[PDB]
Design a protein around this ligand. Structure first.
Ligand SMILES: Nc1ncnc2c1ncn2[C@H]1C[C@H](O)[C@@H](COP(=O)(O)OP(=O)(O)OP(=O)(O)O)O1
Ligand SMILES: Nc1ncnc2c1ncn2[C@H]1C[C@H](O)[C@@H](COP(=O)(O)OP(=O)(O)OP(=O)(O)O)O1
Ligand SMILES: Nc1ncnc2c1ncn2[C@H]1C[C@H](O)[C@@H](COP(=O)(O)OP(=O)(O)OP(=O)(O)O)O1
Ligand SMILES: Nc1ncnc2c1ncn2[C@H]1C[C@H](O)[C@@H](COP(=O)(O)OP(=O)(O)OP(=O)(O)O)O1
Ligand SMILES: [Mg+2]
Ligand SMILES: [Mg+2]
Lengths: 481, 481, 481, 481
């Protein structure tokens, strides 16, 4: 075995060490070719045909770039080939746990199908990784290339999911703490995963990426912070970091949370729920699993991909008729109709436990307007989106360490006010989208009146088109005009 | 209904007329989302996740751009909105007949599964188009927007597949002849289909595109040629056109005929053949079809996409065991091994009827070298590739008309010698690739000796690495050294 | 004369009407080839070799695109070919008044050389335009293509500089008000000039552009607002507009106000001041002008370009020795040294009349630290930069009109709170940079102590590296720590 | 001093070793900021504002990339940091000898002004380099970083211009022969200089680059060939190399030899010739030089840049009136008129000594057509362009060595016939362009008749528009029709 070269449109020619090739050439990894990165986003942005596979290669490549760069600048860190390979493998493998249509599956479907469970793609990645290693005899190959499976497997998993519980990590000691900041940065979110998806998603979406990760890599250094060795950024690059999160937020606003992409994800989720009793996936020892239970057996999960969509769409079984009809309405573009968007005001924050009650509230509103139809709770969908800088209300740049050119080994902190007054005052907000499942002209007119009335009753912000869609409703609220 | 905007990474924001939206939002068209543009190419170029869907949008867009541009420069042509819509629809729909993995299906699978049939994606496109129109009530909508279904449906089909047999077309008269040169140019191959795939494939492959279609559109004009109105290019742009075909050939050499992408297509084709008896696809009136017969019923063909690959891979049926094993070997990257490449010499041309005899010839060669194993015909795959400028031995630029700035309405011809002596002397050639199905070190060593010996016996060109892979064989042939 | 095509790396093949060609092919316009778009920026960003010439072509092109797009969507506006040409010409000609090194000349040099004068490149553009027309016999050519010089020349000038003083414009009536929003938008700054520079500067700088003007053009419409016809943007595009200004601010932070690019501009300005007595530029009737007075005669101003830099650098005249030495220090990269950056706190705002007093304040600070050298006012440079969203403290999106899909003719307003809580709370700030003209190690150490002490005394923000450069100074200030 | 980072739009963030920074920050190098890469090309392609400075940085960067890559793959080569720095410096400095408007100066001007001299930019680069080193105290700095000035300066110069005289080089021995193939490859032309200009020129021209140098670097290796260690390319990459030269030839056809860019270069050259007696450039010890003699004194040559154009344009001296008028006609776009293009036939090859006789031949032709004016030799310009693959009639790929994956240390040769029959049969040709200095309609009509008659008399190829521009002349020649 020798090194392979892969040509990636985003990063160019990437070299893969033979051990990485071995990990990649397994059913568990190759599975990612059949999972769209952006789920339902492809149904709005036709360039977004890309899958988790190629993103994982990129993440693995960049993880290697950063660890190599640090080793070259700072030989005193004693970064070994072994460390590099482990960081690359964690990079390659942090997406292994994704399900059909990526975030649709763990963000919408599993929470509704198995409310009692607490599941994340991160956890799934660790489980799939263990399955990949054991099913394919990778441990001996790791030993052949100088890795120590016991410690290094633990390291790799910790890089993906955090401590499997004071230094809380066992795979490496504090003197190598900075290695835990590369693939999945739990401290402030600044990691190579973002860097790849910014660049790759932009390339495919047809929207231009504003963040320069190559620059960041050039200016990164390791310094001592509170008895840990951590990655620090050059002081003057702080603005670029603020911009990185701004870019992330723009991408969510323009693409990842696109109102129609989301309703498509929602429709697909509904079809999966209606199919979940009837689709069987064979796992370990021939045992049969459902879409919602395949997460319990990695052998079954290996075979759970976007393919399920087409299996349902092309099914002839009358049991799958309701699920199949939903997908067919997607194809004919008879989608649930977007009614509008609003936001909470002041300190008001909508809790997850209240999401189910919201359609009922909308249907209970009593707009003083003449209506041909009356709508019921089940006619409304309410989608609540939490937008933030990756740390709820917290500013991630408060959790970043910097260095200055006159003392490159001395770590410092930079506050928001030392950067600019043009920065956000808050770092989190919620958007509420409302859609109507009845798509005829009269139902939609009515849905608009209910929605705007509900916004007024709850003291939410005025929808942007409120005066046009509900001219009889908006004047009651002085605050709006 | 009003016009929709779609954002495409290649062309930007494309406007779609409501009638086009209606055609697009049907199962027949949306199907193209599940068919990879480059088939097995994705297994070599991980950026090439793109599907026929987005390519079709682009072709439809560019077709519109060119016809609009000509109408704006030359009002005297009397190009109508009706003409524009018809050309856009033909652009959109010329890929409707593609099967799983695009060219794999009509280039390898159908020829082996149904040798008696003569099938092409072009023919399939016309059938799928008719099916799309009839199944979805499109005719009334066409009338609503000023089209005349009888004439215009004929025009659209003729644009895709040529005369459905003097002027041989019925959908438009000779004064609109130039319209037939936009979507699928049967005269010289210069059409909007190439322009989109050059740009889109390059974007995804990570290889840079050298052809500027926007420039070409700016310099295009309609002039009278032999009592037809044809599209002419500005004289000085002739070099750019030679370059366009050079680019096409480079793309085939680097990507579309990549030796490993082709062997993956071949392995997938073999799995399909082994599954063909057992997969059933439901068509019109509940009748059941096979992969190879789905082409006879468009209702069934609608459901025949890349999904078949995963249906086989994930199958548990013991009947599908052999097919499923082939695909699994793809996942583990245990692929048939490439042995080498050579070309015929002089006037020698390999005929299609002789393709089957070639593995037998290779196995019959008697290299004077010590071999642990003897290989048989069934161990060898011989792939013959015809590379040309789109017209067999003919130079397509001999079939292009030009105009000069001093007389923009007078069409002229330009010969190769009026352009450059650095151009090709021939416009067609054949490549022969040999692979071995036995992948162990000793079988591959042997396969190399047989292959090189066969090249020598047939007086084919010396493989580039011949002296390295078969040092005992190459010296016998004086011609090589 | 017929239309010319130009190939631009940003916009592709641009078509130029013959009248535009005639305007372009004059000494007054071609001058712009010898004036760098980014001035001293090229000395930091080596890709920024681009000149005002090519930017002007782009602005003229985009101005045409927008006016054409609006006319095609809304024929009822009665936009004429004449209107289009006039808007294109204003676009082409709004940069004609730039001087050597663009903003350096009217932003730094003229204010210091001729404090009594009030001069702007805008004013210069109008003067140069009039000169161009009269010197080159353009009026007859304009009449030949259907323009009415009296009204249209007025219109063009008004588009550049605003009313040459109710409806305050004379070149077009209120029903064509929207035309005044294309080239130089005095209401909110959203114009084609920005669009071209964002794209072109980014292409040359090596920083990626986040704003999509093509999208914006597609969604733009004209609606009635307060008895004027104005350009409106689609409601949901409001986020993209906020982002456009954010992008502009990032470009200023990263590139246009780069600390070293600015000090280079400052050094060049100083050399020009020292040369201003001795360089003579011949204007109308052989009369001689200086660099600072060439603005009074357009014939002389025509010959005032970046060339002055080299004329000084290559001079042998002993009178120009001091000016020439400054430029030589640029070449050897012996630049004034950047000491640091800080900002005012609270309501504090530095007025233009106080800029001269600032070096003196820095030199008067009394840091309690042992210093080998004492520095004087003349050793310090203080550069005060006003950063905003183009309207001082005002939010430009408050001055934008929108429309919604359900009523495309009805203009509406959108507030900040209807968009996001992640937006800036303020839209303007000031940055203060300090540099030292003594570049030796001991002077620079001292300069750092003075600077930080001055920040503390004035209650400015703590410099980011303050604790490292002045550890003995920073602890006195509790606010900092 | 520590390493600097520069952001280049083509290569990204490039790191510069402190010694390189010192070389760059001198008047001799910074000079290159005032010399356009493409000369008169900017007057046709307005994006091509780029200068030799930024190209030199890129060449220096890529030279470092390649030497680093080879050292990392093959530690047994013993490539030292010293070797790397020397190769970078040669890359940085191989453009130091370019004159105003780059190839215009050594390709047109010097050959006409100083026919007796044999001058090339290469020679100029060595002289400027020596001047740079000596004038700026660089030798000590080189010693400080481990270079040995005697040997290393010799090595650097040899890399630029070849042996200054079996192994003909003194700066390194045969075991380091491969180092001489990086910056300026005298064997086959495949070097980092091309790679940068392909990418950078394309970026600025608005034409897309087809060659992937990063790929080439990844597949490059050093192997023993005829008792030298040389750079070898992977066998299968041979097609990409053919394509690289095809790309180079396309760029010449489309841009570098653009008919109008060339006539502008010719006009500028004529102005320089007319100014050469009167412009004085001050060199060593105050001595005065002319444009054509500044090459004899590097102090003077340091000050000879594109500035000369503007010095002439802006001059008031009546002696410079004729030169100044030529440049003014450029600004008004009153250029010499292109008449047509043709090529020699068969074995016919035009020698340099016959270039001067060609205008006379054109004027002596006797077209049997009625002409209002008779034209003289001095009215015609004949531009003869030799287009090739960099080695006259020779195929450079015959001078490239390859390796195969099965024996990476064994160098091999590949012939054209082992690659493709679609490759050129010849590797050199000549183009003849004719222009007329009389631009009125009747002169140009007449010029066309003379030109086509001359083509017919000389048995050159038929101009593409021949039948249109000279319908009475073309029928006499049966060969044409
Ligand atoms: N000419 C090319 N230009 C750019 N990318 C290419 C080119 N050829 C192939 N690629 C891409 C496709 C793959 O991602 C990657 C692997 O390339 P390739 O060198 O063809 O691998 P290989 O496995 O077929 O060759 P090998 O015989 O060396 O193993 O490079
Ligand atoms: N900010 C953005 N930048 C670039 N492209 C975008 C942006 N938002 C959406 N798109 C792309 C994705 C889709 O292919 C296309 C659809 O645009 P959009 O106007 O969001 O559709 P829509 O159907 O949601 O609008 P409408 O509200 O009229 O229905 O544009
Ligand atoms: N092959 C090419 N690709 C892209 N741009 C090109 C090409 N050739 C020329 N250009 C650019 C340079 C100019 O900006 C613009 C003008 O092209 P060109 O057609 O050569 O004008 P021209 O004036 O020389 O031809 P004409 O003979 O029509 O007057 O296009
Ligand atoms: N935010 C940015 N993004 C991209 N390029 C940048 C950015 N800032 C600066 N550049 C460019 C300008 C230079 O070509 C190169 C390095 O600039 P910069 O890091 O600011 O140098 P510097 O000399 O100001 O820093 P210092 O001297 O503080 O080490 O990168
Ligand atoms: Mg391989
Ligand atoms: Mg610096």
């Amino acid at each position: 075995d020798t090194m392979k070269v892969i040509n990636d449109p985003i990063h160019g020619h990437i070299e893969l060490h033979p051990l990485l090739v071995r990990i990649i050439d397994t059913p568990q990894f190759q599975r990612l070719r059949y999972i769209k990165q952006l789920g339902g986003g492809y149904y709005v942005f036709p360039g977004a045909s890309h899958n988790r596979f190629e993103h994982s290669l990129g993440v693995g490549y960049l993880a290697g770039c950063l660890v190599h760069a640090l080793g070259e600048k700072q030989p005193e860190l004693q970064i070994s080939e072994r460390d590099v390979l482990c960081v690359q493998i964690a990079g390659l493998c942090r997406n292994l746990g994704h399900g059909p249509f990526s975030h649709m599956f763990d963000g919408r479907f599993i929470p509704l199908a198995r409310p009692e469970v607490k599941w994340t793609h991160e956890q799934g990645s660790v489980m799939m990784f263990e399955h990949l290693i054991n099913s394919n005899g990778i441990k001996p190959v790791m030993e052949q290339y100088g890795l120590i499976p016991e410690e290094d497997i633990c390291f790799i998993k910790e890089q993906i999911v955090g401590p499997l519980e004071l230094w809380p990590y066992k795979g490496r000691p504090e003197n190598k703490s900075f290695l835990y900041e590369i693939v999945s940065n739990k401290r402030n979110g600044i990691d190579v995963d973002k860097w790849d998806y910014f660049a790759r998603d932009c390339h495919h979406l047809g929207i231009q990426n504003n963040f320069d990760y190559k620059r960041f890599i050039k200016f990164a250094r390791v310094c001592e912070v509170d008895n840990e060795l951590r990655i620090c950024a050059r002081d003057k690059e702080v603005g670029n970091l603020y911009d990185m999160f701004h870019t992330r937020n723009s991408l969510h606003r323009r693409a990842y949370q696109h109102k129609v992409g989301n309703i498509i994800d929602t429709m697909i989720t509904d079809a999966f729920l209606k199919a979940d009793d009837y689709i069987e996936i064979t796992g370990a020892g021939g045992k049969k699993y459902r879409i919602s239970t395949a997460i319990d057996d990695m052998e079954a999960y290996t075979k759970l991909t976007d393919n399920i969509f087409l299996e349902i769409l092309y099914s002839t079984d009358p049991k799958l008729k309701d699920a199949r009809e939903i997908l067919k309405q997607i194809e004919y573009r008879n989608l649930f109709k977007y009614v509008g968007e609003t936001q909470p005001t002041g300190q008001i924050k909508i809790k997850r436990e209240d999401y189910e009650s919201l359609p009922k509230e909308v249907a209970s509103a009593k707009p003083k307007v003449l209506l041909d139809v009356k709508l019921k709770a089940e006619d409304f969908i309410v989608d609540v989106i939490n937008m933030d800088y990756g740390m709820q209300e917290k500013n991630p740049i408060d959790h970043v360490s910097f260095y200055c050119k006159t003392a490159p080994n001395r770590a410092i902190r930079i506050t928001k006010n030392q950067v600019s007054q043009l920065l956000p005052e808050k770092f989190a907000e919620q958007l509420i989208r409302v859609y109507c499942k009845k798509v005829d002209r009269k139902s939609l007119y009515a849905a608009r009146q209910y929605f705007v009335q509900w916004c007024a009753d709850r003291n939410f912000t005025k929808p942007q088109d409120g005066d046009v869609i509900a001219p009889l409703i908006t004047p009651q609220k002085k605050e709006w005009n």
